[PDB]
Amino acid sequence: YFAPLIDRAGIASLMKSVFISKPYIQREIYHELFYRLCSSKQNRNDLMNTFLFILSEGIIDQHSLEKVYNIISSRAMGHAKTTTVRQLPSDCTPLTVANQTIEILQSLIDADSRLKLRWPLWHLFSLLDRKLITDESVLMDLLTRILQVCTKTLAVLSTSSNGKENLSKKFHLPSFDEDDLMKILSIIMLDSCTTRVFQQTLNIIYNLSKLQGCMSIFTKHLVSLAISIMSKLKSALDGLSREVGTITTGMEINSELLQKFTLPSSDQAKLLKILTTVDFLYTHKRKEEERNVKDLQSLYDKMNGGPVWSSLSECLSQFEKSQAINTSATILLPLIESLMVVCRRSDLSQNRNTAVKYEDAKLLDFSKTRVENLFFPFTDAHKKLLNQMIRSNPKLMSGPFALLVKNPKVLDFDNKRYFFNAKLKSERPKLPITVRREQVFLDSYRALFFKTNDEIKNSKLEITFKGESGVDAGGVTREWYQVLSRQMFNPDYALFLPVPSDKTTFHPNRTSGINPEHLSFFKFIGMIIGKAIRDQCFLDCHFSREVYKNILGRPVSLKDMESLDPDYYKSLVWILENDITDIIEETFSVETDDYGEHKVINLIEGGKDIIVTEANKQDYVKKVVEYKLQTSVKEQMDNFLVGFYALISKDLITIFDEQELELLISGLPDIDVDDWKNNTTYVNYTATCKEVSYFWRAVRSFDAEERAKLLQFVTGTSKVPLNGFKELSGVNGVCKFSIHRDFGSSERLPSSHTCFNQLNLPPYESYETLRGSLLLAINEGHEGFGLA
């Protein structure tokens, strides 16, 4: 029966029923029946309204709870006021009773609407004060969910009721107030707000700002409170401002200050909430197509909090040298979290280079570092273990690491390739292909040819050795990629072959287009390279140190031709480097081995028409390589880019350079170190001139990759021949990457010439200068000798 129902004798009986305690499940019955209590409005109310009056006069303590026991656990016995002198037998506990009524209220009044004398609100506002109410964490999840509901229950009715007293003011809803809003900052800052309670507390305050109409009151009051937060930023951080800055060596300070930032809901998380505030205000409430972003960062930049950063940045990295107990990620990560997540304050986006690195320097710790202005360098100063931890932790990538440009220094590729150990992985119906297993590329046009691009990775690679679609499973690569050293090498077709730029290696070889199926052929290297990546194994055979960048939308390498092909950069020393006065045209059109797009392609804007000048000195030589792999075979690179873009998906993008890819797709090139030591033209630099033989005597010192990535940084065509490298690959493939001293400025770059390798080694000093500069430029890939 709908409509109003019994008034009392179910309520008047409840007087004793409101002093109860029992295991749950018995209480669900209460949920359902009290839900059936709807449509009454008398059983729903009257007792309920005073029940908060009771709780403020009750649960506030067992005594006042016993007071309401006498008042009510009694009135049912005689008349509706007190009597019975009844004494509490512990039949109820404030916590259990409160939480049970709370869950029931959420279950039921959620449906209730159109009615939600501040006394109840005073209980929502004044009683809210109580440590009774400020001494709870276990329920605090449910309390937070409440507070959203209260916001939303109000928000739905906040449309006008909060100001329209027809329904909200049944218990006199004040038209918005701040005292409790101030109470938020004054209390929720406590450890009270669990990490989980912390997040949904952010959500609470988000609603607060929102509800309806509270966007003109709650949001601005919370903004003022946030301003207040800067004041309390150093509530205990100031004492912490040097607690971790003292440690050092075998110094122990213990966990007295650990539980400020290591204790979110005490600090650290405080800064996190500060972030989230304007973030949701901007990232969530606003949207990037609407979000000023800079204003979001302006806050935390114009409202940055500089004071703490320079003061504390100095006090952090002392752990890097110390052997303390409570100055680790426990507390440091809170800072890293903040200091990273923030992406705020002063300059952080200041990615740094390698250069000669002078000769060397001992960066002990993050030395007296300033505010975030000098932070990512702060990271690279704690690099000692920070870089390895990043090599063992991408959780920072998701957390602390919120907005990054410079990080790559400490966030070296070695960290991001570790990410690509899990991000390694980052529907294959059928690809009924044969692929000769020596022809492979040569028959891929008619056999595989990417099976029309990424379909190959979206279809089982039934490619067979000759007819064995299995053997190494679908997509055989054990020798199918090792045989590409013939198919890719492609002695048959012009698609790939010993090139004038690289006789030793096998890159598009210019001609390519002359082959009738070049377009379909390059669809196979559009995939096989992006498929070897998006598939098992890699073909060891090397292409060139300019092919790898051409896989994706990246330019060609001009400084490579210094090594890659001196006939195009060093013999062309009349332009770009060595000698040029913006007049030397130097036949601005390179040899057209292509013969497909043969229009004596201009090496600069106009080539034979326009003079090679400051703008086009690089272009003249660069356009050579552009007319080697990106204009000679550009239409051929069309498929190269199609599959390369198609085959692959967010695969270690921009972490592995061409050398690293050369160390990966072709594998880390091997070396005959014994030869290298007694090779390299070791005396060509004036062995023992305070340097030279120092690296040809202490030879294994640098690194294995520094002896392999160097071989790429000196040739431009990899193809390591070992044997002392006197046949070091190149246009002709000779010279042990000769180490001619050149008696330069002691720091001039090694302008090697793979045809006649030079590897300038000017008058360095006893290691020091010899170390560093070359030890890192070699590990660059397409950044030391390639694109840069």
Side-chain angles (χ1 to χ4, degrees), residues 165-214:
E165 63 179 1
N166 307 350
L167 301 172
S168 63
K169 265 68 150 178
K170 191 176 287 193
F171 49 105
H172 283 79
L173 268 291
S175 196
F176 316 108
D177 55 357
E178 202 278 337
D179 165 39
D180 292 350
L181 194 151
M182 183 278 288
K183 186 187 291 186
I184 299 166
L185 170 148
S186 82
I187 294 177
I188 73 156
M189 183 63 254
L190 299 161
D191 288 330
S192 52
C193 63
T194 63
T195 70
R196 169 253 168 273
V197 169
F198 174 23
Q199 194 285 332
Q200 291 86 27
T201 302
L202 309 165
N203 288 324
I204 286 167
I205 298 168
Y206 190 54
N207 293 319
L208 266 62
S209 59
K210 294 147 73 71
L211 282 72
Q212 193 284 341
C214 298

Side-chain angles (χ1 to χ4, degrees), residues 215 247 258 357 422 655:
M215 199 54 83
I247 44 167
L258 175 72
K357 300 188 285 292
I655 79 169

Side-chain angles (χ1 to χ4, degrees), residues 577-587 589-594 596-637 639-643 646-649 651-684 686-689 691-696 698-699 701 703-723:
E577 89 301 352
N578 197 39
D579 51 297
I580 175 163
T581 58
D582 299 333
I583 197 75
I584 304 305
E585 287 184 355
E586 207 167 21
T587 175
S589 57
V590 71
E591 61 91 19
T592 299
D593 179 30
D594 177 75
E597 185 175 359
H598 194 137
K599 61 176 281 297
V600 60
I601 290 288
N602 294 312
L603 278 183
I604 69 170
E605 178 58 28
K608 291 74 59 182
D609 302 330
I610 299 305
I611 313 307
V612 182
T613 71
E614 276 301 317
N616 285 322
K617 320 195 309 181
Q618 66 189 324
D619 186 7
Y620 160 81
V621 170
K622 180 166 169 97
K623 190 65 200 57
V624 181
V625 179
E626 194 169 357
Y627 195 41
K628 297 312 164 162
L629 284 80
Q630 204 63 247
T631 288
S632 178
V633 303
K634 178 58 181 72
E635 174 56 24
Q636 293 63 20
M637 290 325 178
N639 316 109
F640 200 57
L641 272 292
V642 163
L647 279 298
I648 287 169
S649 60
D651 69 302
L652 73 164
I653 302 298
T654 67
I655 79 169
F656 272 9
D657 59 52
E658 67 87 19
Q659 264 160 351
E660 298 171 51
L661 189 53
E662 188 69 14
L663 273 52
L664 174 75
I665 201 77
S666 64
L668 165 54
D670 64 315
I671 177 165
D672 48 7
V673 184
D674 182 75
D675 299 331
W676 179 297
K677 159 170 59 41
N678 53 75
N679 289 84
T680 80
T681 77
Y682 56 102
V683 294
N684 211 329
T686 314
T688 309
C689 64
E691 60 100 20
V692 189
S693 177
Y694 290 61
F695 188 46
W696 319 131
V699 184
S701 64
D703 196 76
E705 89 182 1
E706 289 189 359
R707 286 183 313 273
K709 309 185 80 69
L710 161 55
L711 290 163
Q712 283 74 245
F713 171 76
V714 69
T715 57
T717 190
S718 178
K719 184 60 63 176
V720 166
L722 294 92
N723 298 114

Side-chain angles (χ1 to χ4, degrees), residues 313 316-317 320 335-337 339-340 348 350-351 363-365 367 369-370 372 374-388 390 396 400-401 404-412 415:
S313 188
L316 314 193
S317 172
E320 200 192 23
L335 298 162
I336 300 161
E337 169 272 330
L339 196 60
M340 293 299 291
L348 73 165
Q350 51 180 352
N351 212 342
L363 279 295
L364 173 62
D365 280 0
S367 302
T369 304
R370 201 181 172 268
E372 187 155 3
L374 322 173
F375 168 38
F376 278 51
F378 187 94
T379 67
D380 295 293
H382 206 293
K383 194 170 173 75
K384 179 270 298 191
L385 201 73
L386 182 61
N387 186 12
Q388 197 253 325
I390 306 155
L396 315 177
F401 304 176
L404 282 67
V405 67
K406 167 160 181 58
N407 216 321
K409 190 175 167 192
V410 75
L411 184 86
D412 59 357
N415 298 301

Side-chain angles (χ1 to χ4, degrees), residues 49-85:
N49 314 116
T50 312
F51 283 173
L52 271 293
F53 202 54
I54 287 153
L55 293 153
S56 172
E57 300 169 339
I59 50 159
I60 54 173
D61 67 347
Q62 74 87 12
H63 317 84
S64 311
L65 202 45
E66 203 282 331
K67 177 190 57 38
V68 298
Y69 190 80
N70 291 113
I71 296 159
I72 299 148
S73 193
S74 46
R75 90 167 193 70
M77 266 60 63
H79 83 269
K81 283 307 300 185
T82 304
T83 188
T84 312
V85 194

